[PDB]
């Protein structure tokens, strides 16, 4: 199982980006998926997650109502639609996958076995 | 001459045996820890494979991992049974017989060492019979000879002076009167007669043996005789010498099959054929043709190379960081320790339970 | 009187220590086999629970069984680590020090036994100093005293003559000249002076110690002195006596926590809280309130009684007859033996793999 | 898991019987089910089996075309319809359940963990 994110880069404040994370195998459809972000100088933190079945989604309070996570098992891909970006959203964004089907696993990085390499998102004002 | 103190040709070979017997407890600790350590390595490998199978449920690789886990668990089980049923007694017996014989020898040597009248006259003489010898450092007359049970730390013992054939330095002595006894040194322990030996108002009533029957001290005015012990046979008045030789020769170490990895074909590895037969073929007997066909489905082959390939897959599998510590390695191959890996397996077995409810 | 042979009050307590040291290797084999055997019992219980969980996938009871299997596997792991890191050295060291001291004592006693002039005059006298004693059966003057390393079979050793305080029969002797020495028996080993002792043309140049420093034989015409060893302190010219006492006092046996079953509440049993926290709560810290609530779902309670109830369920579970033999028991509780249960678990883990593909 | 058969008894040659075997728990629907029969003086032998999913059925050659095995997961019950009985069908009939989902497990008694107590079927001529 390997995760590769894409769709990062530079964006102006108030703009939008869609991050993609494709897993290398159909195993994807048995994995809960999450997005974590590590700001410059800060520790890495939860952003969004979606249950293995796609039935439930979870969001950090700082991104609720701006970000949308979704999944497409047919393409082994999880997405993060990020609207209304602000400079404080600048960070390396990591895709991650957990073998747990317990939704409580989704909100903490420590329950995810699989990690992408992370992609830079930089929002300028 | 008869009834004189002993020159170094007599006691030096006893010093050499005593120093080598001192290492038998070291080798016992070495072998017991190595057995336990190898069992732990077998169990770590079984646990790693088991975790791989719990995480990757479904795949052909997971089934290969189940066969791999069974193999190493059996190795770990069989090594523990060998430690209980064979190694424990072997190593206790070698420790006991060697240490007992060493005490028998050491008490005698220590008696010779102390029984002297002067710097030139006594029971324990140098090579030339010029001076009595003294113990300093751990040596007597230049010969390593501590006359004590040194601290026990693991180490493989030498077999220089006690080996498969016997006590290689304790050969027949045809001229003890000139080669063992000095010409002038006074030593009442060299004889049982009363003029120059242990007898007081007459001779001792019988010959006396010392150092667990190694040396025979006659009650007449004749030179001592010694046992030839370099070509031993399972049997005595020198039984502690036979016991220590037999116990040491019987040791196998933690090197029998239970503690060794198997590197030939897959169908012949411990546990494989049986597991394939019952779990996959639902048969009780099989020809290796059917077994190998079944192994191809899961290992993509049936040789050791395909086995190593699955083991490498297991070693690279990551586990959840919260299961090991705030920053520790998370790939199975970088984790070691039975109890640690056990708790990880339990987490994933519990997750497997939960998935089965949902499914 | 000084310089005379030794009456039984002197050597009988040495016989008693030598006979008890003979059992230290027996207790070492006993403890090493018991440790391995208890580890095997812990592992059998883990394997039985694991099989129960593999068969009954889904149910609350299967999750309870996973927690039970983790507990016993950890006990089995920790007992093997204790055997490697603590018990092996303890038991090798007690075997070595006791057997070494026994050889030191036995060589000295055997020398006294043989050094006699007649039936009435010698170094080893009876209680009254009437006759010299002889070894027959395994006794000397009625005292058990084999002067040999007897065959090693497992047995707990007595602590009658060597115990927590020291060598209880080796007390201070205030009147050796009358209580240890005979009045008439001739014994050149009782003195270092030349008239009646070990000296030939003059006295030995120094006092001589024998039996690993227990008895001191002066080079003057005075009675021997002995060490008082009944109230020992960690420290000598009698070091082998200290070493054997310290090694024996340090033994714990296969009775520490790793080898003992836990019978208190469930949340406090080894491995439980951690497994519940991470596998069920997905938290790293918990108050026992949350743990007990989680245990109620799977054990219907949180005390030892609910634990025993799940264990009884595991013991009654049947397995497929083709996995054990053409007629053997098929309930888990009636099966024992690690490798056997291991192969059964593998069969069911393979079946679990197959069900996951289908599901 | 406990199995109880019923519906045995005496029957005249050429008659019919339906044996029933009810399992004590809904676990039934994860079990392959079989019927084994032990004639007087003989060893016990395979009669019929049905896969855990009900998709496949298997019959000893001596009963093919006369016996029919079927299952009803809603009632946790497996049935053996036995037509055209002959004296040689006299036997103790055992219901049995296997946790295996491999159809090759079904044809040999040694792969079945669970056993009923057996019911007498006696066919007189
Ligand atoms: C028998 O063979 C197996 C398979 O090779 C041995 O298990 C393997 O042991 C090694 C070394 O302990 C593990 O890998 C290496 O380990 C270290 C630390 O754990 C790490 O820093 C390296 O990256 C490295 O990969 C290896 O994962 C493990 N293999 C499996 C599949 O578990 C086993 O120890 C051997 N048994 C005995 C008694 O020697
Ligand atoms: C710690 O406690 C556990 C749980 O009681 C022990 O495991 C249990 O051991 C017994 C006895 O070995 C097994 O049951 C009895 O066994 C025999 C033969 O196997 C049988 O003929 C009887 O019918 C009987 O049931 C019992 O199944 C087993 N329990 C489980 C759940 O596995 C364990 O041995 C104890 N550990 C130590 C070191 O004592």
**Cα-to-Cα separation, first versus last residue of chain A:** 37 Å
For the secondary structure, the number of strands of chain B is 8
Order of helices and strands of chain B: EHHHEEEHEEEEHHHHH
CATH domain topology of chain A: Immunoglobulin-like
Rounded to the nearest angstrom, the radius of gyration of chain B is: 31 Å
| Ligands (ions, cofactors included) | a molecule of 3 linked components (NAG-NAG-BMA)
Portion in helices of chain A = under 10%
Q: Helix segment count of chain B?
A: 9
**Backbone CA Rg of chain A:** 13 Å
Q: What's the β-strand tally of chain A?
A: 11
Secondary-structure element pattern of chain A, one letter each: EEEEEEEEEEE
Percent helix of chain B, as a range, is 40-55%
Number of domains of chain B: 2
Percentage of residues in DSSP E strands of chain B: 5-15%
Percent strand of chain A: over 45%
Main location (chains B, C): membrane
Protein name (chains B, C): Variant surface glycoprotein MITAT 1.2
Subcellular location (chains B, C): Cell membrane
Subunit structure (chains B, C): Homodimer.
């Amino acid at each position: 199982v390997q995760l590769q994110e894409s769709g990062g880069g530079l964006v102006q404040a108030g703009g939008s980006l869609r991050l993609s994370c494709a897993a290398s195998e159909r195993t994807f459809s048995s994995l809960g998926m999450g997005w974590f972000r590590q700001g410059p100088g800060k520790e890495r933190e939860f952003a969004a997650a979606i249950s293995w079945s796609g039935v439930s989604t979870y969001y950090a309070d700082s991104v609720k109502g701006r970000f949308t996570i979704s999944r497409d098992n047919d393409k082994n891909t999880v997405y993060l639609q990020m609207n209304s970006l602000k400079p404080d959203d600048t960070a390396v964004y990591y895709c991650a996958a957990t073998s747990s089907w317990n939704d409580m696993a989704l909100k903490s990085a420590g329950w995810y076995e699989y990690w992408g390499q992370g992609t830079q998102v930089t929002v300028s004002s | 001459a008869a009834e004189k103190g002993f020159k170094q040709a007599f006691w030096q070979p006893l010093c050499q045996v005593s120093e080598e017997l001192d290492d038998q407890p070291k080798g016992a600790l070495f072998t017991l820890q190595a057995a336990a350590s190898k069992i732990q390595k077998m169990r770590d490998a079984a646990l790693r494979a088991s975790i791989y199978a719990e995480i990757n449920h479904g795949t052909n690789r997971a089934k290969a991992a189940v066969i791999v886990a069974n193999h190493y668990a059996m190795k770990a089980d069989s090594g523990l049974e060998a430690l209980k049923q064979t190694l424990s007694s072997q190593e206790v017996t070698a420790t006991a017989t060697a240490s007992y014989l060493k005490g028998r020898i050491d008490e005698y040597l220590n008696l010779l060492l102390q029984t002297k009248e002067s710097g030139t006259s006594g029971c324990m003489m140098d090579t030339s019979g010029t001076n009595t010898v003294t113990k300093a450092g751990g040596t007597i007359g230049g010969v390593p000879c501590k006359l004590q049970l040194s601290p026990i730390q693991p180490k493989r013992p030498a077999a220089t002076y006690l080996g498969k054939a016997g006590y290689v330095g304790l050969t027949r002595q045809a001229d003890a009167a000139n080669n063992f006894h000095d010409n002038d040194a006074e030593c009442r322990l060299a004889s049982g007669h009363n003029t120059n030996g242990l007898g007081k108002s007459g001779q001792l009533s019988a010959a006396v043996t010392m150092a667990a029957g190694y040396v025979t001290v006659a009650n007449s005015q004749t030179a001592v005789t010694v046992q030839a012990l370099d070509a031993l046979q399972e049997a005595a008045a020198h039984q502690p010498w036979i016991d220590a030789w037999k116990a040491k020769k019987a040791l196998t170490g933690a090197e029998t099959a239970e503690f060794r990895n198997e590197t030939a074909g897959i169908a012949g590895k411990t546990g494989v054929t049986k597991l394939v037969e019952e779990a996959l073929l639902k048969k009780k007997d099989s020809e290796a043709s059917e077994i190998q066909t079944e192994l191809k489905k899961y290992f993509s082959g049936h040789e050791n190379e395909q086995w190593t390939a699955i083991e490498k897959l297991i070693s690279e599998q990551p586990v959840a960081q919260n299961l090991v510590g705030d920053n520790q390695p998370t790939k199975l191959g970088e984790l070691e320790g039975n109890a640690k890996l056990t708790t990880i397996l339990a987490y994933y077995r519990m997750e497997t339970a939960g998935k089965f409810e949902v499914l």
